[PDB]
Each structure stands twice: as C-alpha cells, then as structure tokens.
CSV table of C-alpha atoms and ligand atoms in Angstrom, one decimal:
chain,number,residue,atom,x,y,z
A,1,UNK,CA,121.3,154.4,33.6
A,2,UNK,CA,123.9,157.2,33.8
A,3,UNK,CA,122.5,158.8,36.6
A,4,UNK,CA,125.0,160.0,39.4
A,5,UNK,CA,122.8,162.5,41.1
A,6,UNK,CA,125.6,165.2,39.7
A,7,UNK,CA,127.4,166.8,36.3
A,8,UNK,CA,128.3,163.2,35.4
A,9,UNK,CA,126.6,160.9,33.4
A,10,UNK,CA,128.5,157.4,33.0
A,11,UNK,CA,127.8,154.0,34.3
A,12,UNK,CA,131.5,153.3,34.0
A,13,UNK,CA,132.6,149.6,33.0
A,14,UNK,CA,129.0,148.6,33.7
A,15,UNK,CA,128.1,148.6,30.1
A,16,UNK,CA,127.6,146.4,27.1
A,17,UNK,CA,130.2,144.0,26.3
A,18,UNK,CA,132.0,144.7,29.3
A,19,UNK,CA,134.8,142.1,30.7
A,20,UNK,CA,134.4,141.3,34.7
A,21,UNK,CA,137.6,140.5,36.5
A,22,UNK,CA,138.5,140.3,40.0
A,23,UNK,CA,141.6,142.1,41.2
A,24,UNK,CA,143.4,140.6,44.5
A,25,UNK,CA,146.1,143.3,44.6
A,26,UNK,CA,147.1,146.6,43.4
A,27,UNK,CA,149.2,144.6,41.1
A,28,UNK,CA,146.3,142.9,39.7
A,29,UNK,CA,144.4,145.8,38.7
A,30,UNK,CA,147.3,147.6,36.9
A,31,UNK,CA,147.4,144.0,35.0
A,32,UNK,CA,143.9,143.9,34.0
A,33,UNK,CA,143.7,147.5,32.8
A,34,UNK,CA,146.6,146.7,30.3
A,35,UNK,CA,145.6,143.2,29.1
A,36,UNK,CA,142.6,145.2,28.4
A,37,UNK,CA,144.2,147.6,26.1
A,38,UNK,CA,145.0,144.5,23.0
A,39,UNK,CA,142.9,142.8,21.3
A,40,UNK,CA,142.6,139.0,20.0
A,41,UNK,CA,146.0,139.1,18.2
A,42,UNK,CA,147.2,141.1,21.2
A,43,UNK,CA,147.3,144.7,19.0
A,44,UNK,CA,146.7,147.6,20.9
A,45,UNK,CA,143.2,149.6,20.3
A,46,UNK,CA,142.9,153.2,21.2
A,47,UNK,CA,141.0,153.8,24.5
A,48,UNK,CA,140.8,149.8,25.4
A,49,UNK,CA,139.4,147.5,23.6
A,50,UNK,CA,136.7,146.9,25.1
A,51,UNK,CA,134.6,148.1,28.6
A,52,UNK,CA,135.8,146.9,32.5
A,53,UNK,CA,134.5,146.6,35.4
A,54,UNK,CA,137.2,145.3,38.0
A,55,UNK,CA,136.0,143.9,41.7
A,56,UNK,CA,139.0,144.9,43.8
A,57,UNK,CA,139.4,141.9,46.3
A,58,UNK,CA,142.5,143.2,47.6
A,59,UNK,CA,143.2,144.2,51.2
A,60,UNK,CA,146.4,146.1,52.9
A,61,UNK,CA,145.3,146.9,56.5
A,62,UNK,CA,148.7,146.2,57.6
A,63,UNK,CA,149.9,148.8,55.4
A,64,UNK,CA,147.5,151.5,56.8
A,65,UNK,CA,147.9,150.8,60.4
A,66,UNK,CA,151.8,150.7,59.9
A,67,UNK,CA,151.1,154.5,58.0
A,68,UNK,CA,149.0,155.7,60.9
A,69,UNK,CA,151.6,154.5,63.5
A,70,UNK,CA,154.0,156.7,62.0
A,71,UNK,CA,152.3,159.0,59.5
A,72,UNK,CA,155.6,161.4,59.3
A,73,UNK,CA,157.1,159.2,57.5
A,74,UNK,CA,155.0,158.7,54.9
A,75,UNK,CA,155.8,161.7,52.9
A,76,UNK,CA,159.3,159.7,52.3
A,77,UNK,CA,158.3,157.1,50.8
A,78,UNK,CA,157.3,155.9,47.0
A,79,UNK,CA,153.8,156.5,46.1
A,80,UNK,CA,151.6,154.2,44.8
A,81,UNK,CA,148.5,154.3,42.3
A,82,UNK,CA,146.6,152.9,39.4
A,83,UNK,CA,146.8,155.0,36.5
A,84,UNK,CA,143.5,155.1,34.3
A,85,UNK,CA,145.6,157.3,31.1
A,86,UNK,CA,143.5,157.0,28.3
A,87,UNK,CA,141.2,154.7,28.8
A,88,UNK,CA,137.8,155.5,26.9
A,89,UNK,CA,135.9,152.1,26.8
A,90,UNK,CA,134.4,152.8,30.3
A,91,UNK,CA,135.9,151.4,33.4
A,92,UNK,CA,134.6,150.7,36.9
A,93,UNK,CA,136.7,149.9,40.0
A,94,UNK,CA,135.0,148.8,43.3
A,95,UNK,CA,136.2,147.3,46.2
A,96,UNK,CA,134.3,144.2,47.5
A,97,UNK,CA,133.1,144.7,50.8
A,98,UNK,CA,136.3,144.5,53.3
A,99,UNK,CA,138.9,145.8,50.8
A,100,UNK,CA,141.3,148.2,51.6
A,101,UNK,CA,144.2,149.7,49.5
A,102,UNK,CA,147.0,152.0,50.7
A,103,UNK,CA,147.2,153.1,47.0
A,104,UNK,CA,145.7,155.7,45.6
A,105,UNK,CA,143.9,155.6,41.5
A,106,UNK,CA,144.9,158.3,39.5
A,107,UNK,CA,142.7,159.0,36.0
A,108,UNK,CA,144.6,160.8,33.5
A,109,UNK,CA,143.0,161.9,30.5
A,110,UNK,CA,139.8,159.1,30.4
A,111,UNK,CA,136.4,159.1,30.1
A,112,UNK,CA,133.3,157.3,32.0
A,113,UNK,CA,135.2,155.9,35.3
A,114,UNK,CA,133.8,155.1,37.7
A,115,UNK,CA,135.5,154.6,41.4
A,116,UNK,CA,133.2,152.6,44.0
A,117,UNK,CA,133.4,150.9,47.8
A,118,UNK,CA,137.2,151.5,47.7
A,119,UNK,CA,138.3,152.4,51.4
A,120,UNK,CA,141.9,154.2,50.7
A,121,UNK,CA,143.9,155.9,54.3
A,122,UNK,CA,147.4,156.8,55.0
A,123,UNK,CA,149.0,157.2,51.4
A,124,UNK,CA,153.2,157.0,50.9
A,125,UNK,CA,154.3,159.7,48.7
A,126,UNK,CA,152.7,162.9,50.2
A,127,UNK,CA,155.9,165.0,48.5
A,128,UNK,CA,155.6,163.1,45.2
A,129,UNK,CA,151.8,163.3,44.0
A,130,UNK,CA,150.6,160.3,46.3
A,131,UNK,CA,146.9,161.2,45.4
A,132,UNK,CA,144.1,159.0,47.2
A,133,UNK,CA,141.9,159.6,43.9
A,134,UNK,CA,143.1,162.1,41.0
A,135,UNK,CA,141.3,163.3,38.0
A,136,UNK,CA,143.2,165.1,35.2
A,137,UNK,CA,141.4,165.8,32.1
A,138,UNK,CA,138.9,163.3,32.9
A,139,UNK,CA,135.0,163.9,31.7
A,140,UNK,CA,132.1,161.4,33.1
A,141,UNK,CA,134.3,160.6,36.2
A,142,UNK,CA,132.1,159.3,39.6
A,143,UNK,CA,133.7,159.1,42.4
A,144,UNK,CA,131.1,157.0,44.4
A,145,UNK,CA,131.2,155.7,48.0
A,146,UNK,CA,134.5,156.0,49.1
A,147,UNK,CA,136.1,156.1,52.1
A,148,UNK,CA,139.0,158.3,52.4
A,149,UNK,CA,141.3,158.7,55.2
A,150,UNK,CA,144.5,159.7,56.4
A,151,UNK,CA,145.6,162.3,59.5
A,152,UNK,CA,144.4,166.0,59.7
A,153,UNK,CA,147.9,167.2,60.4
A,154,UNK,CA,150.8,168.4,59.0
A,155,UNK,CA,154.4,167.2,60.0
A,156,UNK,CA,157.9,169.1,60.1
A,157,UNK,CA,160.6,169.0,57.8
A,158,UNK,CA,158.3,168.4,54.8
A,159,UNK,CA,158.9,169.8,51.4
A,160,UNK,CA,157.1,172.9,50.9
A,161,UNK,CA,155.3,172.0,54.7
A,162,UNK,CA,152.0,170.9,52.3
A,163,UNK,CA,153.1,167.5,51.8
A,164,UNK,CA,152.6,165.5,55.0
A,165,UNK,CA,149.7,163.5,53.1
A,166,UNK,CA,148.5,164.2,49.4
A,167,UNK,CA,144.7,165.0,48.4
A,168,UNK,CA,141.9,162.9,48.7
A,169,UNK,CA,140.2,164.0,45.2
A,170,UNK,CA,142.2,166.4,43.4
A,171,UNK,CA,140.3,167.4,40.1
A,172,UNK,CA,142.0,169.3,37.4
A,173,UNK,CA,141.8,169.5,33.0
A,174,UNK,CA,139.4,168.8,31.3
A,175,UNK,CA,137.4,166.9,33.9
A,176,UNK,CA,134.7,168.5,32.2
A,177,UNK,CA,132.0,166.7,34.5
A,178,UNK,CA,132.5,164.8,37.9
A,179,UNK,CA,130.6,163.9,40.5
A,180,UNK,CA,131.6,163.2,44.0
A,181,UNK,CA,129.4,161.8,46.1
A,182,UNK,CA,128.9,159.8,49.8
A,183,UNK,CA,132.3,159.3,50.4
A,184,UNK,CA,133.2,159.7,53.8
A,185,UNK,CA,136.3,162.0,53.9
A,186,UNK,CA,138.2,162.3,57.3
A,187,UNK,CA,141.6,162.9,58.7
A,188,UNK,CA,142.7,164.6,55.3
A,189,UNK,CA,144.5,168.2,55.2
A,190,UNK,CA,144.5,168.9,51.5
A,191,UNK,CA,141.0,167.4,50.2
A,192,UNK,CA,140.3,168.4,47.0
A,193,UNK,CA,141.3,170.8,44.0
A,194,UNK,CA,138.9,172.0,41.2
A,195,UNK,CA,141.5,173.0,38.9
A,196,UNK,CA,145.5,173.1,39.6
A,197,UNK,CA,146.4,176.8,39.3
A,198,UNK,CA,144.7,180.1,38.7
A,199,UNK,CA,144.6,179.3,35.0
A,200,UNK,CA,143.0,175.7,35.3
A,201,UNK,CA,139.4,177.1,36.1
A,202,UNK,CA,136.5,175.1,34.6
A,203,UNK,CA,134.6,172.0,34.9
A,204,UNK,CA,131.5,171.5,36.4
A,205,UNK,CA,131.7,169.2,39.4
A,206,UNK,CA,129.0,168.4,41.8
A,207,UNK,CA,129.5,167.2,45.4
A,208,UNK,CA,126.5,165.8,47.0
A,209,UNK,CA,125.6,163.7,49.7
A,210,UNK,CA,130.0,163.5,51.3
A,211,UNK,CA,130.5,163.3,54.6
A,212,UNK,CA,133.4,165.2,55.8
A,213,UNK,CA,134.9,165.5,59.0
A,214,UNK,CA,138.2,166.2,60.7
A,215,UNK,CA,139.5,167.8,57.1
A,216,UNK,CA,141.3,171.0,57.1
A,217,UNK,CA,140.8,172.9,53.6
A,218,UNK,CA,139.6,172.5,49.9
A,219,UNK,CA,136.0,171.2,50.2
A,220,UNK,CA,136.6,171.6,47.6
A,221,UNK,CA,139.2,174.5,46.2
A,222,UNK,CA,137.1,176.1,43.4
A,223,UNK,CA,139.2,177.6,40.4
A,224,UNK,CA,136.2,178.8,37.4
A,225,UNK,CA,133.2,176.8,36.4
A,226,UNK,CA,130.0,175.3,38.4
A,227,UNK,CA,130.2,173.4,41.5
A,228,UNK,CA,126.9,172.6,43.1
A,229,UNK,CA,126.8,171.5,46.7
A,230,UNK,CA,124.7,169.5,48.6
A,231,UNK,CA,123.2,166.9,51.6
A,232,UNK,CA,126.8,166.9,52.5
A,233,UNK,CA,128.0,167.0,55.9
A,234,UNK,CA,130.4,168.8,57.0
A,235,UNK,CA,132.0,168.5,60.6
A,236,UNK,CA,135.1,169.5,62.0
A,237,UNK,CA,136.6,171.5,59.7
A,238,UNK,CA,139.6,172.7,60.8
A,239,UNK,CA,141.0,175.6,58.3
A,240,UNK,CA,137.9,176.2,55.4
A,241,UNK,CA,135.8,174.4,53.9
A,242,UNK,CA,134.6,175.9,50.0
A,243,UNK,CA,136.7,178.1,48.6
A,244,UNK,CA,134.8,179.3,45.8
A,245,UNK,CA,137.9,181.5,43.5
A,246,UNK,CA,138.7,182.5,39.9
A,247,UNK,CA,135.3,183.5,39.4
A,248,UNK,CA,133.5,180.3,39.7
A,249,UNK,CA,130.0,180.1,40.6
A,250,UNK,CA,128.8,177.6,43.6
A,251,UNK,CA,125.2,176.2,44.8
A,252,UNK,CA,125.3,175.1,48.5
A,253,UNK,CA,122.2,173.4,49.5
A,254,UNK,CA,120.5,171.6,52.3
A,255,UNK,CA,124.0,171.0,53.5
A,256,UNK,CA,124.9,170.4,57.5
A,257,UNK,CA,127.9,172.5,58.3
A,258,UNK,CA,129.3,172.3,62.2
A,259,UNK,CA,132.8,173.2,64.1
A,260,UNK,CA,133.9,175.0,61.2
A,261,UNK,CA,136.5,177.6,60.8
A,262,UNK,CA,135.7,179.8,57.0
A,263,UNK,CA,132.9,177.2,55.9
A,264,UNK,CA,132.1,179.4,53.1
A,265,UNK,CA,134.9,181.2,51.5
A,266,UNK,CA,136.6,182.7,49.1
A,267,UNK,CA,140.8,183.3,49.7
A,268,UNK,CA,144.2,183.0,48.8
A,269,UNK,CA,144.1,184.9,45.5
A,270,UNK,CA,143.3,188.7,46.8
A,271,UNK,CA,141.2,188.6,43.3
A,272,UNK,CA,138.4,187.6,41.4
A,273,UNK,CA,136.0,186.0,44.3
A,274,UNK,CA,133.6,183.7,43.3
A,275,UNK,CA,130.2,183.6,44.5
A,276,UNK,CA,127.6,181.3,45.6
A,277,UNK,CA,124.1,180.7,46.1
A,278,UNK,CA,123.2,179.7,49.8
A,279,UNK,CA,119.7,177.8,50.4
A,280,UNK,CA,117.9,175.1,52.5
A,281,UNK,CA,121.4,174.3,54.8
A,282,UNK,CA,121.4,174.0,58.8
A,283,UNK,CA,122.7,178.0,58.9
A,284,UNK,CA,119.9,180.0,57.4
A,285,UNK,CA,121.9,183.5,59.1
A,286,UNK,CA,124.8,184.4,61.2
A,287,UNK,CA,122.6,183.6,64.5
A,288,UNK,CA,123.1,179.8,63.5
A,289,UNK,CA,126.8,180.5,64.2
A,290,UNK,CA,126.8,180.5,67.5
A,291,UNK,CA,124.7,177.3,67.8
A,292,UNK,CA,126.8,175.6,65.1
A,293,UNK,CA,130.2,176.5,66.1
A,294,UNK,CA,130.5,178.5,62.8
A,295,UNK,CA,133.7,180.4,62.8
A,296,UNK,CA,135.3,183.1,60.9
A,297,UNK,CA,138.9,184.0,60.6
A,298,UNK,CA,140.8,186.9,58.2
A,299,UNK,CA,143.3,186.4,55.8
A,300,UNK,CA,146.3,188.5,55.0
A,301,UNK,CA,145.0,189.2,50.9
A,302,UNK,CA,141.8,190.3,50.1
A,303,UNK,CA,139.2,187.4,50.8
A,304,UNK,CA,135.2,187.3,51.1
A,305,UNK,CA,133.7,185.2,53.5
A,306,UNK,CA,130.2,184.0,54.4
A,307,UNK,CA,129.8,185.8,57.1
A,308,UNK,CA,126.6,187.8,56.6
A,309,UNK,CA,125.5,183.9,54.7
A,310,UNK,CA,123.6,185.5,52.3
A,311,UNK,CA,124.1,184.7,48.2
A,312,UNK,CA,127.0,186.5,46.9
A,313,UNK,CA,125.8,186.0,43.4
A,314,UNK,CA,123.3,183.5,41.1
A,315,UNK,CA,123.8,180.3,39.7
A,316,UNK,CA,122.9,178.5,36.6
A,317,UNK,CA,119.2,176.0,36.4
A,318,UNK,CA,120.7,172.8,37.6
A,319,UNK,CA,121.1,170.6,34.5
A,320,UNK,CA,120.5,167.0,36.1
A,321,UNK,CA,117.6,165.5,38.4
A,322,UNK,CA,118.3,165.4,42.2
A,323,UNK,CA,116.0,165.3,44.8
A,324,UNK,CA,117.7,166.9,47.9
A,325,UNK,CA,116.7,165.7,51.5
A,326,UNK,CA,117.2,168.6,54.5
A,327,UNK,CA,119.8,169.4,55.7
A,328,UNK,CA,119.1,167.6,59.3
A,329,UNK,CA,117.9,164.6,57.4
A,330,UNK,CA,121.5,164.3,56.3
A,331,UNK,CA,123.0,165.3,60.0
A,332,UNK,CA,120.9,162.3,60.7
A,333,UNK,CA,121.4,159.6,57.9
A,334,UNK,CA,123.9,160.4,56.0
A,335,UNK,CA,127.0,158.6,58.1
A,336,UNK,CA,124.9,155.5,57.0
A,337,UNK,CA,124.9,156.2,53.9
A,338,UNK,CA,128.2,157.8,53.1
A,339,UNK,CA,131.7,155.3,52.5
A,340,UNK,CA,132.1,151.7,51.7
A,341,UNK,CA,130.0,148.8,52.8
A,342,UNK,CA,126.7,150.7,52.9
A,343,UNK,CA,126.4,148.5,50.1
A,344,UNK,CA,126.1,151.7,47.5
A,345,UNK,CA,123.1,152.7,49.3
A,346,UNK,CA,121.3,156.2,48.7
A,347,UNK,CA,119.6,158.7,51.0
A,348,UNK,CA,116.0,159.7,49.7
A,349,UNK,CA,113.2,161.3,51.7
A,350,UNK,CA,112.2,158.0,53.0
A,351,UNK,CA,115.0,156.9,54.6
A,352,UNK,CA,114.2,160.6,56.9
B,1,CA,CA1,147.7,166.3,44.4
C-alpha cells in the first residue's frame, strides 16, 4: 500500500524490482543513489534505473554531541546532505535502529521518497542551506518517523540572525503532496516552510501524528494550498506554532497544544490571512487558555490570531482515509509513537 495517513500516496523504494542496499555512512548513501542512476552497460536512465530502498547503518554521535557542545559554531561550517535530484524510480531511506546522521537529506525535484527511522540533530551549515530534511518540487514525499533535533536558540553574529541552525522540514515547489508524520521535532527554531516566498503557495501537505516540542516557529509556515493538521502534539512552543498565510486553508484536529505562544496564527505578511478549521483539539475555547498555558502576543503588521479559537473559514472533504484518535489520547501515547526506534509503530484507538 501507499497509504501515509496524509496527501501522499507512495511506498517509496519499497516497490517491485527494487535494489536493497545498506549504507554505513553518509558517503555510502550518496554512492548507492548514483550507482543507481546506470544501467548494465553503466548508461545513465532518466529518474534511476531502477527502485531503492537504502538501510542507513551509519552512526555520527560524536558529531552531534561535538555540535551541541558548541552549537554557535555550527552556522560556520560546511553543510552536509544527500541530495535525492531527480530521482523518479522510488526511493526509501531508513535508519536502522541506533543510526544517527549529522547530515541532513535534501529532495530536489523527485517523486515517491520516502524518509524513515533517521534521527538527524545539530546540523553544520545553518548560513548555507544545512536543511535536516528539504523538499523542493517533490510530489509523493513521506517524511516518516524521524527524529529531528538541534537547539531552540538563536546565536549572535549570524548572517541575517536566522541562521544559527537551518529547518527541520522545509517544503517548497511542486511538492504537490507530502506527508509528515510522527517525527519527534525538538530544539529547532525554524521548523518548517510550506512554500519559500509569498509566491510559492500551493501543495497540499498533511502533518499528523508529530510531536513537537521546545520549537520556536513554522509548524509549519503555510504559504497557499491545504494543510490538514492532526494527533500532533505540540509543547513548548516558544514564538508560534501554524501560520496559516497567502490564503491557504488549514484543518487542525484532535491536536494537543500546551506552553504555547500564537499556536494558531496567521502573520508576517500584513495581508491575505489564511483560515482554518478548528475541531476535536485539547482547546475547545479561550477558557482552555488559561489551563493550557495558551498565549497570545501582537505583531507589528496586520496579523489574525486564534484567539476567540473559533474557524476562521472552511476546508475542503479530506481526500485520504485517517482515523483520528483525541486529542488526550495523543498527549498520552503519542511520545511512544512519534521518532525513531518505535519500530514505525502507529497510534490507533486501541493503543488509547
Ligand atoms: Ca531551509
């Protein structure tokens, strides 16, 4: 099956005729991917030539704690990522259990990837596009049980004062239909785009069953197109958490927001708010804010806010099958459920 539980329908490298090799580095995984891209007289076939599914063996720990123990400087320092441009064939990464990789992947103009049980922190290259996971024109994309780290904070002398750390799921183009779901986001200031600039709006993206917490903005940053939110959990946000802009249209349901600033937002442009559709999450109305620790701050252009947490506008008959759990079932199970060596695992009604 295809099923992601979100916009995307892929199974990734898990498909017919699909080639199973074992990456020990970062190295080894750039290797595969362009071995794959000749065939038996070693020409070169459009999109790959054939499907992959690459087990990621690899571990840099030392890497990561040397980033945490001085995370100013990574912004400095080289980036590092596997680039998935133009590769068609489907393709799935996963980390084995006990992986780690202080490199990020970075899709560029694919189709049917899917990224799994890869636990990426700390990233060099926060000035130069260091992405944890990027998607850029990239349709069918799942982004599956990751865990995605770095430090909520923000360093001085950085370019542009934005670049301490980069993203931890930046989705732009044509990435027509992603789906992000139980990764366990933490310690990241910049999460995630939905479109790169006022103009890139689009895409319909669903985010389900993510566990967020100690992340300061973009949950994610909503330019256009459909974003459909829910069973995630959202702690400790420090800044806001959806900004729903450029018109787009959001669902947020049966979600567990707490300790955070401008959950549900819409800012930074002074124009053309999106709107969203609030139902089944731990807030039902502005009493829940108190007990929550729901806060609300201004902005100084025009900006909309949840505030009153009522629907700000409609949203479109959900195209896939998802079976939502409530929203203190996923306060509850979820950080079991959500990351790497939960060995994929799902939360249904069950499990509550
Ligand atoms: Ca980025």
């Amino acid at each position: 099956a295809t099923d992601t539980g979100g916009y995307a329908a892929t199974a990734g490298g898990n498909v017919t005729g699909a080639v199973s090799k074992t990456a020990t580095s970062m190295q080894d995984i750039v290797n595969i991917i362009d071995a794959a891209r000749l065939d038996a007289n070693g020409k070169k076939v459009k999109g790959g030539a054939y499907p992959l599914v690459i087990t990621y063996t690899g571990n840099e720990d030392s890497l990561i704690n040397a980033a945490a123990a001085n995370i100013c400087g990574q912004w400095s320092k080289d980036p590092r990522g596997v680039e998935i441009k133009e590769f068609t064939k489907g393709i799935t990464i996963i980390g084995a259990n006990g992986s780690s990789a202080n490199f990020g992947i970075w899709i560029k103009k694919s189709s049917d990837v899917v990224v799994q049980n890869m636990r990426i922190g700390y990233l060099p290259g926060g000035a130069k596009d260091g992405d944890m996971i990027r998607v850029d024109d990239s349709p069918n994309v799942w982004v599956d049980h990751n865990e995605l780290f770095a430090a909520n904070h923000e360093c001085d002398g950085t370019p542009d004062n934005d670049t301490t750390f980069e993203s931890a799921v930046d989705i732009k183009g044509a990435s027509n239909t992603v789906t992000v779901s139980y990764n366990y986001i933490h310690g990241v200031k910049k999460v995630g785009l939905d479109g790169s600039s006022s103009s890139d709006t689009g895409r319909n993206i669903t985010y389900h069953h993510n566990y967020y917490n100690d992340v300061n903005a973009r949950l994610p940053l909503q330019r256009g197109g459909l974003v459909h939110a829910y069973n995630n959990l959202y702690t400790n946000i420090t800044g806001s958490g959806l900004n729903v802009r450029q018109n787009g249209q959001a669902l947020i349901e049966n979600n567990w927001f707490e300790k955070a600033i401008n959950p549900v937002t819409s800012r930074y442009d002074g124009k053309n708010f999106g709107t969203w559709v609030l139902k089944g999450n731990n807030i039902t109305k502005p009493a829940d804010f108190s007990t929550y620790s729901i806060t609300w701050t201004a902005d100084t252009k025009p900006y909309v806010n949840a505030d009153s947490w009522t629907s700000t506008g409609t949203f479109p008959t959900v195209a896939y099958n998802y079976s939502p759990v409530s929203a203190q079932c996923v306060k509850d199970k979820l950080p079991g459920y959500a990351g790497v060596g939960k060995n994929l695992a799902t939360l249904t009604s069950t499990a509550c």
